[PDB]
Amino acid sequence: TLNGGITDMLTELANFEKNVSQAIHKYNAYRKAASVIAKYPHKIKSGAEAKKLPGVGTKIAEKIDEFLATGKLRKLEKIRQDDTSSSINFLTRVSGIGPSAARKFVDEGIKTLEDLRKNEDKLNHHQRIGLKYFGDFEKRIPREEMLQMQDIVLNEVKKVDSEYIATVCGSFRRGAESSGDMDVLLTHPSFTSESTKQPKLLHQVVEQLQKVHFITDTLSKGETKFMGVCQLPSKNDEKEYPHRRIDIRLIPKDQYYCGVLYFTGSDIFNKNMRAHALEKGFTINEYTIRPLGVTGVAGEPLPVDSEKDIFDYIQWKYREPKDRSE
DNA sequence: CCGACTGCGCATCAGC
DNA sequence: GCTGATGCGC
DNA sequence: GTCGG
Numbered sequence: 001t002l003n004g005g006i007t008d009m010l011t012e013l014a015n016f017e018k019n020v021s022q023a024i025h026k027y028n029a030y031r032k033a034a035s036v037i038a039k040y041p042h043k044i045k046s047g048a049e050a051k052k053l054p055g056v057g058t059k060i061a062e063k064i065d066e067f068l069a070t071g072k073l074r075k076l077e078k079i080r081q082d083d084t085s086s087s088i089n090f091l092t093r094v095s096g097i098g099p100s101a102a103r104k105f106v107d108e109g110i111k112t113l114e115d116l117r118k119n120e121d122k123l124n125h126h127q128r129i130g131l132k133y134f135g136d137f138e139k140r141i142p143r144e145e146m147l148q149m150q151d152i153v154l155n156e157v158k159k160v161d162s163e164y165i166a167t168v169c170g171s172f173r174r175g176a177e178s179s180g181d182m183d184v185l186l187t188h189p190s191f192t193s194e195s196t197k198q199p200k201l202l203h204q205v206v207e208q209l210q211k212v213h214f215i216t217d218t219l220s221k222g223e224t225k226f227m228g229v230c231q232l233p234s235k236n237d238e239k240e241y242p243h244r245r246i247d248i249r250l251i252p253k254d255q256y257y258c259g260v261l262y263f264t265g266s267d268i269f270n271k272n273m274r275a276h277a278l279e280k281g282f283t284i285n286e287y288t289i290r291p292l293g294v295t296g297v298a299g300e301p302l303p304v305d306s307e308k309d310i311f312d313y314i315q316w317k318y319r320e321p322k323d324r325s326e
Numbered sequence: 327c328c329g330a331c332t333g334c335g336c337a338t339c340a341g342c
Numbered sequence: 343g344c345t346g347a348t349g350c351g352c
Numbered sequence: 353g354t355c356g357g
C-alpha cells in the first residue's frame with residue numbers, strides 16, 4: 001500500500017477500459033502497470049520516476065503526475081459522473097455479467113440492483129446465481145475460514161476415493177491472510193495425459209460435496225472444471241457464514257506441477273511468466289511447457305518434475321508461492 | 327514507427 | 343446434431 | 353497503453 005492511490009487509479013482505469021471501452025489490451029496495460037508499481041519499494045514522487053518501470057509509458061506517467069499534484073484524476077472524475085459508465089461498471093460486478101451483457105442490459109433500462117431482481121427471467125443461470133449472492137461474493141474469506149473449508153474438501157474427497165489428491169491453490173497457497181474465493185486442484189491416478197480410465201472423476205467429487213451441503217450452487221460444470229458456490233456449516237443459534245465462490249480444476253496426475261503453478265497464480269504473475277517464456281522461446285499452459293520451433297509452432301512437452309523445473313527452462317530463479325503475489 | 331499483447335474451460339449462439 | 347466464434351471467467 | 357524490433 002506504499003502507492004495505494006496510484007495503483008487504485010490504474011486499477012480503476014483498467015476496469016473502465018475492460019467494462020466500458022471493451023479494449024482488453026488497455027485493460028491489461030493498466031493491470032501490468034499497476035502490478036509493477038505495486039511491488040516497487042519506494043514512495044513514488046513523480047511520473048518520470050515511475051516511467052522508468054517496465055510497463056509504465058508516457059500516458060500513464062502524465063496521469064501519475066496529475067494524481068500526485070491534485071490528489072485525483074480528472075479523467076476518472078468524469079467517468080464517475082457518467083451515468084452509462086457507472087451503470088455498466090455496476091452490472092459487471094455480478095458474476096456471469098460481462099461488458100457485453102451489461103451494456104445490453106443498460107440498453108433495456110436494467111441498470112440497478114432493483115432492476116435485476118424484477119427481471120431475473122432475463123438472466124441466464126450463472127447470472128441468476130451471481131445476483132443471488134451479490135452481497136456474499138463481495139465479502140472476503142478470512143484464512144481461518146479457508147482452513148475450515150480445506151478440512152472439509154480434503155476429507156470429503158478422501159471418502160469418495162483415497163487416491164484423490166486435493167490441493168487448495170490460488171491466493172491461499174500464496175499465504176494470503178484473506179482470500180476472495182477458494183481454488184482447488186484435483187488429481188486422481190486414473191486421469192493422465194495418456195488416458196481417462198475412469199469417467200465422472202470430477203462429478204463424483206461435486207456430487208459428494210453437495211451431499212454434505214457444502215457445495216450449494218453451480219455456475220458451470222464439465223469434465224475437468226467446476227464453477228460454483230459453497231458454504232461452511234454454522235453452529236447452533238449463530239448467523240450463517242456468507243456463501244463463497246469455489247473453483248475446482250481436475251488436471252492430469254502427471255501434469256500436476258504445470259497445473260499447480262498455473263492455479264496458484266497470481267493471474268498477472270502467470271501473464272508475466274508466460275510472456276517471459278515466449279521471449280525465451282517457450283510456451284507454458286496449465287499442462288505443459290513446450291519449446292517453439294523455427295516456425296513458432298510448439299514442440300513436444302519437455303520433462304517437468306517440480307515447479308522449479310519450469311522456472312529453470314525460462315531462466316527464472318525459483319519464486320515461492322508467497323512471492324508470486326503480483 | 328508498429329505489430330503483438332498468456333492460455334484455456336464452460337456456456338451460448340451462429341451457421342450448416 | 344457438429345463446428346467455430348463469442349462471452350465470461352479461471 | 354506499452355514496448356521490442
Ligand SMILES: Nc1nc2c(ncn2[C@H]2C[C@H](O)[C@@H](COP(=O)(O)NP(=O)(O)OP(=O)(O)O)O2)c(=O)[nH]1
Nearest residue numbers: 170171179180181183262263264265266267270352
Ligand atoms: N494463466 C492465467 N491464470 C489465471 C488467470 N486468472 C486466474 N488464473 C489462475 C491463477 C489464479 O491465481 C488462479 C485462481 O484464480 P482466482 O481465484 O480468480 N484469483 P486468486 O486466487 O489468485 O485471488 P483471489 O484470492 O482474489 O481469489 O487461476 C489468467 O488470467 N491467466
Ligand SMILES: [Mn+2]
Nearest residue numbers: 170171181183
Ligand atoms: Mn482464488
Ligand SMILES: [Mn+2]
Nearest residue numbers: 181182183247
Ligand atoms: Mn477462483
Ligand code: NA
Nearest residue numbers: 051052053056
Ligand atoms: Na517504462
Ligand code: NA
Nearest residue numbers: 092094095097
Ligand atoms: Na462479472
